[PDB]
């Protein structure tokens, strides 16, 4: 129809009353955007945190008042750089430095020489990941000028039961001597001394060619075993191989425990085995190798 000429003035000032209205809102909103900004600066909260306290090892750390299990930087006396570790700390003030872990087969343990030297896997505060700390570190932690050390091995079958085995004056040599495993004696434990060797029943010599005390470290790409073939290649791991092994905690992860000869390609038993506790055809579900100054193990 077309609006009235006298309507034009009411209509005209109505638009001003909403333009300014809008304008005011626009200024209040910009101001509120500004406030939302200061809310969006922090990153996502990473749940995994490294503890503040540090020392020569987990036992040193635990003696400085550390109470709970988690990730810690340690630095042995003769080391250049410091390095992260899992420290297990119990109610009695014991700080175990864990250097090996198995539990779900998530990590592939068929790694080369460098890889076993430097380390692979992941560290987790809940201590729920598979890892190898790295030989070089293990050597450093266990050879600090006149500190007798001890290794505990912790197994777990696919049926609930767990078993330990201890070793006094535990020690790993330098790269020079191919990270040699030495210990004074078996310190007891219902898993049984599998480093003494095992009478497998395929030959009278077995007991010796399966012992680990004195063995050098071996990977497929660095054969240092007492067998003209390649233990670490065939058994597909990195371990202190003889000809070849009674205990094989860095072995291939077999789900369920039971595995057979046809499970493997090269005929031999490559699983995570500990011969004094279970048959060479039973592979453990959980595996843990940890060390603590000997004077601390009662």
């Amino acid at each position: 129809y077309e609006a009235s000429i006298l309507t034009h003035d009411s209509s005209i000032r109505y638009l001003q009353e909403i333009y300014n209205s809008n304008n005011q809102k626009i200024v209040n909103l910009k101001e509120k955007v500004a406030q939302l900004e200061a809310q969006c600066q922090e990153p996502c909260k990473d749940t995994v945190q490294i503890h503040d306290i540090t020392g020569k090892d987990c036992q040193d750390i635990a003696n400085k008042g550390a109470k709970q299990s988690g990730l810690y930087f340690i630095k042995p006396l003769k080391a250049n750089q410091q390095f992260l570790v899992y420290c297990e700390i119990d109610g009695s003030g014991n700080g175990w430095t864990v250097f090996q872990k198995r539990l779900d087969g998530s990590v592939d343990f068929k790694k080369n020489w460098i890889q076993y030297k430097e380390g692979f896997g992941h560290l987790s505060p809940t201590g729920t990941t598979e890892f190898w700390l790295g030989n070089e570190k293990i050597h450093l932690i266990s050879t600090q000028s006149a500190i007798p050390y001890a290794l505990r091995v912790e197994l777990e079958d696919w049926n609930g039961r767990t078993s330990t085995a201890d070793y006094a004056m535990f020690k790993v040599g330098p790269e020079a001597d191919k990270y040699r495993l030495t210990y004074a004696y078996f310190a007891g434990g219902d898993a049984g001394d599998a480093f003494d060797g095992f009478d497998f029943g395929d030959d009278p010599s077995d007991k010796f060619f399966t012992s680990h005390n004195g063995m050098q470290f071996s990977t497929w790409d660095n054969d240092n075993d007492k067998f003209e073939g390649n233990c670490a290649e065939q058994d597909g791991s990195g371990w202190w191989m003889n000809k070849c092994h009674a205990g094989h905690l860095n072995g291939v992860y077999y789900q369920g425990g039971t595995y057979s000869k046809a499970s493997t390609p090269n005929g031999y038993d490559n699983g995570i085995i500990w011969a004094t506790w279970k048959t060479r055809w039973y592979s453990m579900k959980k595996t843990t190798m940890k060390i603590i100054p000997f004077n601390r193990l009662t």
């Binding site: 497998f200 395929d202 010599s205 060619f209 073939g229 011969a275």
Partner: peptide, 4 residues
């Protein structure tokens, strides 16, 4: 185990 051992070997041959």
């Amino acid at each position: 185990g051992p070997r041959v």
